[PDB]
Amino acid sequence: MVEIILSHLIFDQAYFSKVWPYMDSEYFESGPAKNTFKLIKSHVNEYHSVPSINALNVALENSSFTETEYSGVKTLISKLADSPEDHSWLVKETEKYVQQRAMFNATSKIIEIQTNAELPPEKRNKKMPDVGAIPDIMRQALSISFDSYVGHDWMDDYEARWLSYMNKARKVPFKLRILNKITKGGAETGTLNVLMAGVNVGKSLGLCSLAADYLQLGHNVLYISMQMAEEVCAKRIDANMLDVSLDDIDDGHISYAEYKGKMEKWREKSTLGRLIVKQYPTGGADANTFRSLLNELKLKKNFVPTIIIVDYLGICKSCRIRVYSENSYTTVKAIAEELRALAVETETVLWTAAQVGKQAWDSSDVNMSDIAESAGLPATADFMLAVIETEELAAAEQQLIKQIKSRYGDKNKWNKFLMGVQKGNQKWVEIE
Amino acid sequence: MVEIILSHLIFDQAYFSKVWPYMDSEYFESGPAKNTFKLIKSHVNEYHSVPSINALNVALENSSFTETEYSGVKTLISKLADSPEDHSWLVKETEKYVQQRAMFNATSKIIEIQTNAELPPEKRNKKMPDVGAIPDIMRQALSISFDSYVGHDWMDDYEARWLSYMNKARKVPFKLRILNKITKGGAETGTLNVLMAGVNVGKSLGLCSLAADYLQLGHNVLYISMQMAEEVCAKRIDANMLDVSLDDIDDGHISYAEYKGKMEKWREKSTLGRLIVKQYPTGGADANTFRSLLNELKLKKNFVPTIIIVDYLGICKSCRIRVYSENSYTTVKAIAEELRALAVETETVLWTAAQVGKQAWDSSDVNMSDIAESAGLPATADFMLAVIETEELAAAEQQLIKQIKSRYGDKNKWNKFLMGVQKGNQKWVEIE
Amino acid sequence: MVEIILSHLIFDQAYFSKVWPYMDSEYFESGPAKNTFKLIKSHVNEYHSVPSINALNVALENSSFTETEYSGVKTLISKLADSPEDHSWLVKETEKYVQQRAMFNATSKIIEIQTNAELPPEKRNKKMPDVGAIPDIMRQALSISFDSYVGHDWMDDYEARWLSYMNKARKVPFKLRILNKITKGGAETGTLNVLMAGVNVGKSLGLCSLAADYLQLGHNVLYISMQMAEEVCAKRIDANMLDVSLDDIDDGHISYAEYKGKMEKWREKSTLGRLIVKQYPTGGADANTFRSLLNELKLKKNFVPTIIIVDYLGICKSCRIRVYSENSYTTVKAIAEELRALAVETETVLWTAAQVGKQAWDSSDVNMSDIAESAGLPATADFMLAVIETEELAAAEQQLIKQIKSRYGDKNKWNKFLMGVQKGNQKWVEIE
Amino acid sequence: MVEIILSHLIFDQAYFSKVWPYMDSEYFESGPAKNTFKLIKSHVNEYHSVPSINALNVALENSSFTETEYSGVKTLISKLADSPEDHSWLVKETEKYVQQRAMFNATSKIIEIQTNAELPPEKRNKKMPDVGAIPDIMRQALSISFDSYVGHDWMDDYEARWLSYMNKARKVPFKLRILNKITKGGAETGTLNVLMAGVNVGKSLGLCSLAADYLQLGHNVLYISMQMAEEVCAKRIDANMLDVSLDDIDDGHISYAEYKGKMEKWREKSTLGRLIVKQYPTGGADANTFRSLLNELKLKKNFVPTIIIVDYLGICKSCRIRVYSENSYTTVKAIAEELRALAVETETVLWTAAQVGKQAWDSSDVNMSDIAESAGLPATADFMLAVIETEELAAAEQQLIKQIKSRYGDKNKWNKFLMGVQKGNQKWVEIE
DNA sequence: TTTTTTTTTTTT
Ligand SMILES: Nc1ncnc2c1ncn2[C@@H]1O[C@H](COP(=O)(O)OP(=O)(O)OP(O)(O)=S)[C@@H](O)[C@H]1O
Ligand SMILES: Nc1ncnc2c1ncn2[C@@H]1O[C@H](COP(=O)(O)OP(=O)(O)OP(O)(O)=S)[C@@H](O)[C@H]1O
Ligand SMILES: Nc1ncnc2c1ncn2[C@@H]1O[C@H](COP(=O)(O)OP(=O)(O)OP(O)(O)=S)[C@@H](O)[C@H]1O
Ligand SMILES: [Mg+2]
Ligand SMILES: [Mg+2]
Ligand SMILES: [Mg+2]
């Protein structure tokens, strides 16, 4: 029914107002229909009005396509004529036609991706998406229903807004009291929280301590280590949970009986979730890789995480920018934005680590301007905490956590407090 | 390869154990292959054992099909032979075949769903799923593999992680008591270890001493040199091992009797490894060149290294970044990441050296901020030591090895420790 | 004998382990044999084992091949069969076949090289080697035997190392005993030696004196002067060797009989080499230019230098770097690395010059931190020297040398030795 | 080409004496060309003189030739003319022909060697060289050049070098006795010479003066100005040459009659050169635009300069630096290198100006350390005169010339000298 | 040819 759609795009102002915002060039044909719609779209972009038959003929004469295409477009334009119709049958039929064409294009692209990925490398016609984003494309084929959400009205829609304040399902409480106090109830789902410490100051000890604390509070935690292996992170978690020093495990001061007893005692407790550690090579995982990991975890292991942790965003690969194409600023900003998009998609608290510049190392204070790889990371991150350690603090078994970007509350209040990091047990303890 | 799959299902046993749970009748065909697999599955369900060829013939006789296909099935079971193929290739090829067939089935299913949706509701099939199920089932076809483990589970896999604590399987001792003490068992496999010092301060001296100590502990050590050539390194090793000064070699104070006698005395030891010294042009070798070198070392001789000593990573080239496309920071970070990836792939301890800045060449203390080239090298490294030499230290044949970074222990317990350095013998001795 | 080679690759473990590491795809043909070897090589790379017939004709042959290629590969794979042949005749015949194919490929390559170079520019197919490097390709093709020579085994190659020690077949002695007692026999072959003096302090008087000494020692010397003309240097050499003041050759106090006669005196001496002087514009000569000059000298003048003296390292250009960089650190380091690579490739002692920092001007002592252009140059140099004659040594015709970096020995043993400069004769004399 | 070669062997003397030693029978053909050269070689041997074309015909008349050869030889002899080609093109073309024929013969010989090598050992030719001789044979093909001049060969070019010292082939006098005294006969070709303008001491006045003394000595001078127009610079030149004060021209004291009379008086003198003034915008002239200007002047104006004077080094731009700066050190160092490269490649004396440090401005004495361009100009400059002005020197109409860097001669011989600067006529006169 | 981030280096 392409002829009817074009005719009522021309000879119906009411029809054009609703269907146009959604009409696209890939929904008609590879011949006369697409060319006619391209003519109409160019005229609309140039004059912001629906062209007439004379305007279409003039644009057709000032066009460069061949004789066959010219004749087809001329016949199609000559066949366009308004008919007595009703707005509803046309809008519903157009929605059905657009949905069918979107599904057809999506399945054609799916077949193309499958037949392209099944090719020897270096001859796979790059810039074509991989099989990993096969379902997502189909998800885009179903989100076309002529029902775009205009937005949220402050006065018209306030009961629904008020039924989001006492819900509190968005906030995931910590286990430390100070972190809950500064965040006013803990971190929120669909966010990107960051730890900035430097090199060998913490920043993975803190992530492991957070993972252990969330695990004790009945949470499913997905640790993703882009550098350290799976047994080192698991060893850190074991040291945190079992209250056994990493030196004791290395020096064999803990027996198999004690280890088994502690593990079974933790297992028999109802207030304990599941922690899963996954390792990827440095620069070999992205947002799409994490989504594939999420899907295979949900299917194979029936594991649905809420506290997804990534060891370092700077070590991950952007899923949109080719490697080493853009500078550190753009690449890191894109990676952080994609991670935040993943977090809001799966509705999980995302925790990450970030390096500071060389000038901030061995300094008694770390500012937000000391971020290493990009200034956009603080802009695209919900909460950031700076971990500072000096010789005096190290001798006191304490670290100073400074609130650098506090989006859940006022950062001026409680800006710097001293945590009791214990490096042997990979644990954070409070001083209150 | 359905014939191979069926033959190794009937005959091979470990392949049957690994591949049978991930087998469905929809993966094979709609003809003789499907019928044969159905017969095998029925037999294995009746009797919990793999059938034989005579059993297959009996099942065909008692459980019959239409002769049209029955002839094709009986001629299909005439070629299944033992054919002792290797297990890894067979498993990988079967996995690829089942993944391809799953993708084909998912595409056909989504096409059928789309076709059914187009049909009017009066005559549309009821067993077919709705269009909304198209994405998820596609995901069900994306995550199909033979990997029963998707990650590391803290509570599920408490066993097989305690084994890694009893038997280290990662630690490699240092032959020096101070380094073992500050490392708690020595450097670990799949790690990048760095000695940082000023120009001609003794980066090669320390690396040669470590190589000699590893060689005395029955280790395969591969010394790759982008500079310093080859012979020069073997002379340093000879000075360390044969207890002859460098001046003696270049002044002719050692006879061929002493040299050959000491070499054969070392050869008679059963606790001696192999030391291959390889030379590459400065800036003319990368991680892939190292992988090719390892492959040719494994082929042309029975040499698989456990220690890999790269003389200086700064004078290597990245296997991803084009030459001089990026600055020092990005290139050196990429080189360090590639070297660590090589280390984790080969499960070897990779030692290397790095230069310090121009400002630290005449300083009694060297900080992590004094690293030359990238600041991401300390981030990528697993263990970094700073070699400091001053006039007072040189007057006593000693250096000031300082812990810059340590993923093996707390860097503050023994941060700075004096080490006697015999430059004539190119040897590190410990003060006792 | 391609069929026999492939058959015994598939069906012989000993033959495979003997001949596979020396196999290349450029040896068989441009038809079925090359495709079969590609399949075998891909299988061995992927699974580290020799493929079987089933793996070849099922798991691998189902790939992107045309009908003719598919038929040829099928026929060749079906024709493969194990044949009983002695495993001393097979290896020798395979080695002969490989050598013949390498020679054939080299001949075709040099024919293509000549055809390309015969064509006029703008169509000359860059990155293809010039006509000068025809003999090296043929020589490489000649030495294509199946001998395992990967690196320098420490225990297996101590005989050759001792031969190198006793022959001292790396040292090139100086004519000055002071420079021989600190270098333990002079400079080594594959080395980069540097002089740092300042502005109008030396830095070419020293290079000219070293060239004159090497000329008197029978060495072939190549003086590449980027900053000085081909004649300004020669005249300095004449002043050094003829014991005539540099001013006397300008005012005219030396008669032609003296000049020609003194020259004839040197010519009659059999311990005199060639000091060929070649000038390049300042900033217009790289390592590739020097290689072209070496090839031209070898072909035309039959001149193979043992000493290469570049008048100034910092006014050359980098062959690897394509876009000029305002950062002097990277450019000078790249130039030094390329020069040292050239030196180790040609086994020629390479002397050059470096500029000291303005702070070091009129300073009684010059440290290594006074290097001006780059801090990477001292890291790549094998031996550096500093000239620090400020004001009083000039009145006594003296120059003090500090020995800033010494890779031939301990630089703290004889740090200063107060060389006897003579600027009129442009030479160095000892203070014995 | 063979016809031309034989014709100019018969009918020329310089061509014969130049190309006969490099002429062989195998270089021509297997029919007319080779036989005809054989006749020339035969006659050149029995009678040591070039045969007459009739004598060459007499050789054909009296020689063993097959009917076809004898005819072929007669036709070729009748086809030789005494036409006059240019010598350089003839020598170059016959060299190329000889090189191509030698390469073809060597390639055919190595192919024949390889073919003979792949033959039954019992059955092969003994005279054919072994395969190992292939790389040497090609070398003999590449060692064919009518004239070998790769650089300056010491002990092989001493007679030519002496003719350079006596004839002062490189020196260009100054017309000022003091400047000739300190340069041992003037500046040299292929050099960069700069004057260190101090505190508002000067701006082009000196370079304009240098553009008059060279003009009076007969040299072609190209004055490139950036901060001035052509008319203004030529007005400064007129002031110096016509003895008219600079302000007198603007005021109008000098009339057209006197101006034209003085100009024609200068034109009558045969000891006068040509001055070409070219203007470029500030920062819009790198030392690659100057090459284009020289090419245009040579092609169109036939003006090949011996002196090139650039108004100001700082105003110039680097050919390949992209980013320019009003007063940046990196640009000045690059500009100096590019200008000196231009001087070397054009064999011209290049003069320019640069600013100095404020300390050099306040202090009457100027140190190389006290220079705006440090380690950049006193490294690429053969001569650097420090022209500074003092109120006392001003009151006496003088300027103290100090010699800060003299590659030509000893810097301390005559370092300080007083110059009679006239600021009105823009002139330098000597002081008794 | 400019523009902007980050780093590293060096010169004043
Ligand atoms: N095995 C161990 N035993 C004891 N202490 C350890 C051990 N590993 C690490 N530490 C301590 O933990 C501190 C911080 O460890 P990490 O969390 O790995 O630092 P980091 O910031 O994550 O390292 P990078 O540079 O970001 S990869 C170190 O400085 C050590 O003091
Ligand atoms: N060939 C040698 N003969 C004698 N002593 C040497 C020799 N090479 C090095 N040394 C001594 O050992 C010290 C360190 O040398 P290396 O370990 O080779 O240098 P490095 O720290 O690797 O730095 P580079 O690579 O030379 S910039 C020197 O400063 C000397 O004291
Ligand atoms: N013709 C000469 N007569 C006498 N002494 C000279 C002569 N040329 C140079 N010198 C002296 O030689 C030294 C100059 O060093 P050179 O060997 O020319 O190299 P350089 O000048 O230091 O290099 P740069 O980059 O040009 S500063 C000074 O001590 C001069 O006095
Ligand atoms: Mg970390
Ligand atoms: Mg080194
Ligand atoms: Mg010089």
**Which residues are bridge partners to C173 per DSSP?**
none
C130 with D120: CB under 8 angstroms? Answer: no
CA dist B98 and B92 (Å) reads 10
C-alpha dist (Å) from residue B313 to A373, B373, C328, C344: 22, 11, 21, 19
**Spatial CA neighbour of C172 closest among C213, C225, C223:** C213
The Cα B23–Cα D15 span in angstroms is 88
Spell out the residues 6+ positions from residue C383 whose beta carbon is closer than 8 angstroms to its own.
Answer: C183, C187, C191, C193, C194, C405, C406, C407, C408
Cα Dmax for chain B: 104
Tokens read off for A287? 């947002």
B352: amino acid identity, one letter: T
Provide the CA C54 distance to its chain's centre, in angstroms: 49
Q: Return d(Cα B224, Cα D374) in angstroms, integer.
A: 41
For D373, half-sphere exposure in the C-beta direction (CA atoms, 13 angstrom radius) is 29
The whole-angstrom distance between residue B256's C-alpha and the CA centroid of its chain comes to 42
C-beta of residue D323 within 8 angstroms of C-beta of residue C326? yes
For A153, left (φ over 0), alpha (ψ -120 to 50), or beta? Answer: beta
Cβ-contact A372, A355 below 8 angstroms? yes
Place of tokens 């006789």: B61
Tokens representing C64 are 């992107």
Structure tokens at D245: 């004060």
- HEC string for chain D: CHHHHHHHHHCCCHHHHHHHHHCCHHHCCCCHHHHHHHHHHHHHHHCCCCCCHHHHHHHHHCCCCCHHHHHHHHHHHCCCCCCCCCHHHHHHHHHHHHHHHHHHHHHHHHHHHHHHHCCCCCCCCCCCCCHHHHHHHHHHHHCCCCCCCCCECCCCCHHHHHHHHHCCCCEECCCCHHHHHHCCCCEECCEEEEEEECCCCCCCHHHHHHHHHHHHCCCCEEEEECCCCHHHHHHHHHHHHHCCCHHHHHHCCCCHHHHHHHHHHHHHCCCCCCEEEEECCCCCCECCHHHHHHHHHHHHHCCCCCEEEECCCCCCECCCCCCCCCCCHHHHHHHHHHHHHHHHHHCCEEEEEEECCHHHHHCCCCCCCCCCCCCCHHHHCCEEEEEECCHHHHHCCCEEEEEEEECCCCCCCCCEEEEEEECCCCEEECCC
- Start-to-end C-alpha separation, chain C: 71
Residue C383 DSSP class: E
Amino acid (one-letter) located at B49: S
Q: How far is A301 from chain C (nearest CA, A)?
A: 29
Rg from Cα positions in chain D: 32
Cβ–Cβ below 8 Å for A249 and B165: yes
Closest residue, chain B, to A132 (C-alpha): B142
Report the SS3 class of residue B202: coil
* Dist. CA D344–CA D322, nearest whole Å: 24
Cβ proximity of B157 and B315 under 8 Å? no
Please report, for residues B155, C85, C95, C99, the alpha-carbon distance to residue C91 in angstroms, rounded to integers and kept in the order given.
56, 10, 6, 12
Q: Tell me the best of B194, B196, B199, B200 to mutate to test the pocket of ligand 2, counting ligand atoms within 8 Å of each CB and taking the most.
A: B200
Amino acid of residue B17:
S
**How crowded is residue D125: how many other Cβ atoms within 10 Å of its Cβ?**
10
User: Is B231 within 8 Å of chain C by CB?
Assistant: yes
* Gyration radius of chain B's alpha carbons: 31
Instruction: Give Cα separations from D155 to B107, B200, B284, C276 (angstroms).
Output: 84, 40, 39, 9
D207: left (phi over 0), alpha (psi -120 to 50) or beta: alpha
Q: Which amino acid is at C182?
A: I
Contact B428, B207 (CB under 8 A): no
Cα D183 to Cα D175: distance, rounded to the nearest angstrom? 12
- Name the residue among C107, C235, C279 with its Cβ closest to that of D110: C107
Q: Scan for tokens 């060239």, then name that residue.
A: C211
A401 by DSSP, 3-state: which?
Answer: strand
**Left, alpha or beta for C403 (phi > 0: left; psi -120 to 50: alpha)?**
left
Q: Is the dihedral of CA A226, A232, A234, A240 positive or negative?
A: negative
d(CA C135, CA C114): 12
Nearest to C282 by CA among D383, A29, D343, A146: D343
Give the distance from residue C42's alpha carbon to the nearest chain A alpha carbon, in angstroms: 11
Residue D409 neighbours by CB under 8 Å, 6+ apart: C247, C250, D182, D183, D184
Tokens 């290739």 belong to: B89
The 8 Å CB, 24+ separation contacts for D229-234 are D229/D279, D230/D277, D230/D278, D230/D279, D233/D204, D233/D208, D233/D277, D233/D279, D233/D311, D234/D275, D234/D277
User: C-alpha angle with apex B94: B91 to B80, nearest 5 degrees?
Assistant: 100
Which residues, 6 or more positions from B303, have their beta carbon under 8 angstroms from its beta carbon?
A: B220, B222, B274, B276, B297
Q: Please, is D143 exposed, middle or buried when counting C-beta atoms within 10 Å of its C-beta (0-12, 13-18, 19+)?
A: middle
Is the separation of the CB atoms in D196 and D340 below 8 Å? no
Residue of least CA–C1' distance to E2: D323
Q: Is D415 annotated as a binding residue?
A: no
Q: Domain spanning A171-429: which superfamily? A: P-loop containing nucleotide triphosphate hydrolases (3.40.50.300)
Q: How far is CA B193 from CA B319, B336, B430, in A?
A: 20, 10, 20
> What DSSP designation does B416 have?
B
| A19 CB-side CA count, 13 A | 32
In this structure, which topology does domain B177-430 adopt according to CATH? Rossmann fold (3.40.50)
Q: A9 with A20: CB under 8 angstroms? A: yes
Please state, as a whole number, how many other Cβ atoms lie within 10 Å of the Cβ of residue D328: 15
The torsion angles phi and psi of D100, rounded to 5 degrees, stand at: -65, -45
Give chain A positions within 8 Å (CB) of B326.
324
Q: How far apart are CA D54 and CA D52, in angstroms?
A: 5
**Cα–Cα distance, C26 to C101 (Å, whole number):** 8
The answer to whether the CB atoms of A249 and B110 lie below 8 A apart is no
User: 3-class DSSP state for residue A285?
Assistant: coil
CB contact set of A11 (below 8 Å; sequence gap of 6+)? A80, A81, A82
Q: Check if the beta carbon of residue C278 is closer than 8 Å to that of residue C230.
A: yes
d(CA C312, CA C224): 9
Closest CA to B79 of B138, B32, B147, B25: B32
A81: burial class by Cβ within 10 Å (0-12, 13-18, 19+)? exposed
Under DSSP, the state recorded for A252 is T
Token pair recorded at residue D231: 């008319």
Tally of CB atoms within 10 A around C145: 11
Q: What is the resolution of this structure in A?
A: 3.6
Tell me if A119 and C64 make a contact (CB, 8 A cut-off). yes
Among B131, B152, B189, the residue to mutate for chain A (most A Cβ within 10 A): B152
Measured between alpha carbons, how far is residue B241 from residues B237, B303, B353, B398, C155 in Å?
6, 21, 22, 20, 11
Can you identify the CATH homologous superfamily of domain C166-429? Answer: P-loop containing nucleotide triphosphate hydrolases (3.40.50.300)
Q: Which two tokens stand for residue D12?
A: 């020329």
Method for structure elucidation: cryo-EM
Discontinuities in chain A (C→N > 2.5 Å), after residue: none
DSSP letter, residue B357: P
- Phi, psi (rounded to 5 degrees) for A424: -65, -40
Beta carbons of B386 and B416 less than 8 angstroms apart: no
Which pair of structure tokens corresponds to residue B16? Answer: 């049957």
Which residues have a Cβ under 8 Å from the Cβ of C99 and sit 6 or more positions away? C142, C144, C145
Residue D265, token pair as written in the block: 């008086």
Number of alpha carbons in the 13 Å side-chain half-sphere of residue C133: 13
Cα torsion at A357, A359, A361, A367 (round to 10°)?
-70
- Cβ neighbors of C160 (< 8 A, separation 6 or more) are none
Tokens linked to A244: 């056994």
Q: Give me the sign of the Cα torsion angle A130, A136, A142, A144.
A: negative
Distance between CA atoms of A366 and A356, rounded to whole angstroms?
Answer: 8
Q: What are the Cα distances from residue A161, in Å, to A150, A154, A155, D263? A: 16, 9, 10, 95
Residues whose CB falls within 8 Å of the CB of residue A288, separated by 6 or more in sequence, listed in order: A130, A132, A133, A319
b/e map A247-267, b = 16+ CB within 10 Å: ebbbeeebeeeebeebbeebe
Other Cβ atoms less than 10 A from the Cβ of B237: the count is 22
D167-429 falls under which CATH superfamily?
Answer: P-loop containing nucleotide triphosphate hydrolases (3.40.50.300)
* Closest protein residue to E11 (Cα–C1'): D329
- Would you tell me the crossing angle of helices D67-77 and D53-61 to the nearest 10 degrees? 170
Residue D195: strand pairing partners:
D353, D385
Neighbour-count burial of C62, counting CB atoms closer than 10 A to its CB (0-12 exposed, 13-18 middle, 19+ buried)? exposed
Burial B149-179 (b: 16+ CB within 10 A, else e): ebbbbbeebbeebbeebeeeebbbbbbbebb
Give the Cβ contact number of residue A407 at 10 Å.
14
Closest by Cα among B35, B105, B34 to B64: B35
Backbone angles phi, psi at D392, to 5 degrees: -65, -45
> With a 6 A CB cut-off, is B246 part of the ligand 2 pocket?
yes
Position B389: which residue type?
E
CA distance A108 to chain B (A): 10
Cβ atoms of D177 and D430 closer than 8 Å: yes
The letter for the amino acid at A202 is: G
Please, what is the end-to-end C-alpha distance for chain B in angstroms? Answer: 67
Is C98 in contact with C82 (CB distance < 8 Å)?
Answer: no
D328: tokens are 């940046």
Map tokens 């090609």 to a residue: D138
Instruction: Note whether C155 and B267 are within 8 A (CB).
Output: yes
Phi, psi values for residue C153, rounded to 5°: -65, 135
Q: At what angle do helices D87-117 and D134-142 cross, to 10 degrees?
A: 170
> Six-digit token pair at D25?
């029978």
* Protein residues whose CB sits closer than 6 Å to any atom of ligand 1: A 197, 199-205, 227, 246, 423-424; B 379, 406-411
- CA D380 from chain centre, in angstroms, equals 18
Is any ligand 2 atom within 6 A of the Cβ of residue B229? no
> Which helix (H) or strand (E) is C289 found in, with range?
helix C287-296
Question: Sign of dihedral through CA atoms C80, C85, C91, C97?
Answer: negative
Q: How many angstroms separate the Cα of C349 from the Cα of each of B328, C171, C209, C346, C401?
A: 29, 9, 15, 9, 20
Cα D405 to chain centroid, rounded: 24
Give the total residue count for chain D: 432
The three-class DSSP label of residue B363 is coil
**Under 8 Å between Cβ of B378 and B357:** no
Q: Which pair of structure tokens corresponds to residue A42?
A: 């160019």
Q: Report the alpha-carbon angle B162-B167-B172, nearest 5.
A: 130
Joined together, the tokens standing for residue B323 give 């030459």
